[PDB]
Design a binder for this molecule. Structure first.
Ligand SMILES: *CC(=O)N1CCC2(CC1)CC(CNC(=O)[C@]1(Nc3ccc(Cl)cc3)C[C@@H](C)O[C@@H](C)C1)C2
Ligand SMILES: *CC(=O)N1CCC2(CC1)CC(CNC(=O)[C@]1(Nc3ccc(Cl)cc3)C[C@@H](C)O[C@@H](C)C1)C2
Ligand SMILES: [Mg+2]
Ligand SMILES: [Mg+2]
Ligand SMILES: [Mg+2]
Ligand SMILES: [Mg+2]
Ligand SMILES: [Mg+2]
Ligand SMILES: [Mg+2]
Lengths: 5, 236, 236, 5
């Protein structure tokens, strides 16, 4: 999965 | 509300203890209680709220993905029929996830966003609104899916518009918003070109503004910039 | 019971899904429902029950230890008074932990142990009884502390007596029981010599019986034997 | 902490 914050 | 009898300051103190103990459900319930006191949240308090719910919903999403993968495998050719249990339990987790999202969105709507006038607070809450509609969108399969997606897009877009007008390109909230809106484009809106364009432009504009920062601010900004680069590497 | 309407087989199926999703609270609630159907548990089912509650209570114990350490620091000389919140929240976590222990002990008492006639099932349940009294003992500070400690000791001792009579020294249940009873002696009963003696004797008696085993049984036994050695290394 | 299973 891609990075989120 | 079960937290109605507890002092605001005590709720905040306990949210911090819960974070130390990695008790994120408790942390979220304390912060919910704090929000419901009706006073605006400071920066530190907004971070506690976001950290608590991010961690609760993150665990739910991970579990949903495990269950959804098992369910998909069950509906392949030559898979043995095992009854309704996998669907039922995926639905149970899904309903709990939706509940948490609705709770966060309810706090934002009653009344955090309307009282948020400074750019940093309003952008932060709008980013959260986009995030929790995005988590709703991940599990949506029905009549309202398009409207749920549009609600995420609308919140993110309002946050972007304010952030571009009012905040420097290195601001960690502006960066984190852009990171997440880029992921929305890639994973939810079937717009990988828009996702890549946004991540690249955000990274490059931040790069150009690093010279203005202290050492500590440089560290804060570059940490999030690296995530933009990581996504770009994943996508290209 | 909220699980009263669900089929036993469906509860077991969902416990396995919950384990895959690392949803240990759900896993425990499913297994509780399965036990309350009133039928004896198979070996695999006993393992699911134990895994679920071990993981729930393990998380509670870790959180309790974090909070207890903060509370201890607050009661040192020169520590600033911060009010009742740390004690209150440690108490909240403690009460939830006690509740989970009481729930497991209740399942064992109504009626898993009394129906368990084979050595493997009876020893396994008695080990669990000792374990959950040991977790109660870790947080006990009152009038009943000695009786809680004695209840743990008594359960472990009955399990040891049956295991020595009925099971080989390499049996994984006999090994795991001895490992945990040794820790009880070290950490709860203030008997480090007894802890070390038990771990050493158990390790050596198992070593001498490895020659009788298949490759797969050898792997199973040696995995737990290594933990006995690890504890001995810690303690000497 | 010591090991238990
Ligand atoms: C009040 C306010 O505007 N804040 C909230 C705190 C803060 C942004 C400023 C500073 C915190 C630092 N956190 C991170 O950098 C990170 N998480 C987030 C960053 C940005 C946003 Cl909008 C949300 C969360 C957490 C650390 C561990 O890793 C970073 C990659 C991201 C957030
Ligand atoms: C039905 C029965 O008697 N069982 C239950 C399953 C089993 C013992 C036999 C086999 C399982 C293997 N598990 C482990 O070896 C371990 N956990 C436990 C071992 C022994 C006991 Cl009494 C309880 C738990 C889990 C693995 C991941 O690490 C090992 C070090 C311990 C338990
Ligand atoms: Mg007040
Ligand atoms: Mg649904
Ligand atoms: Mg553009
Ligand atoms: Mg039936
Ligand atoms: Mg107490
Ligand atoms: Mg002896």
């Amino acid at each position: 999965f891609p990075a989120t914050v | 509300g079960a937290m109605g009898s507890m002092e605001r300051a005590s709720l905040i103190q306990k949210a911090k203890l819960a974070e130390q103990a990695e008790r994120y459900e408790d942390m979220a319930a304390f912060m919910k209680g704090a929000v419901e006191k009706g006073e605006e949240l400071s920066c530190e308090e907004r971070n506690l709220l976001s950290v608590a719910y991010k961690n609760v919903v993150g665990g739910q999403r991970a579990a949903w993905r495990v269950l959804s993968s098992i369910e998909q495998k069950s509906n392949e050719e030559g898979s043995e029929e095992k009854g309704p249990e996998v669907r039922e339990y995926r639905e149970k987790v899904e309903t709990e996830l939706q509940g948490v999202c609705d709770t966060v969105l309810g706090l934002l709507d009653s009344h955090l966003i309307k009282e948020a006038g400074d750019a940093e607070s309003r952008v932060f809450y709008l980013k959260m609104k986009g995030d929790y509609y995005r988590y709703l969108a991940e599990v949506a399969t029905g009549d309202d899916k398009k409207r749920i997606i549009d609600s995420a897009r609308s919140a993110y877009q309002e946050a972007m518009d304010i952030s571009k007008k009012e905040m420097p390109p290195t601001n960690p909230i502006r960066l984190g918003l852009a990171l997440n809106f880029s992921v929305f484009h890639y994973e939810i809106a079937n717009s990988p070109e828009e996702a890549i364009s946004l991540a690249k432009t955000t990274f490059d504009e931040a790069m150009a503004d690093l010279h203005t920062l202290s050492e500590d601010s440089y560290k804060d900004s570059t940490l999030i910039m690296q995530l933009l680069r990581d996504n770009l590497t994943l996508w290209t």
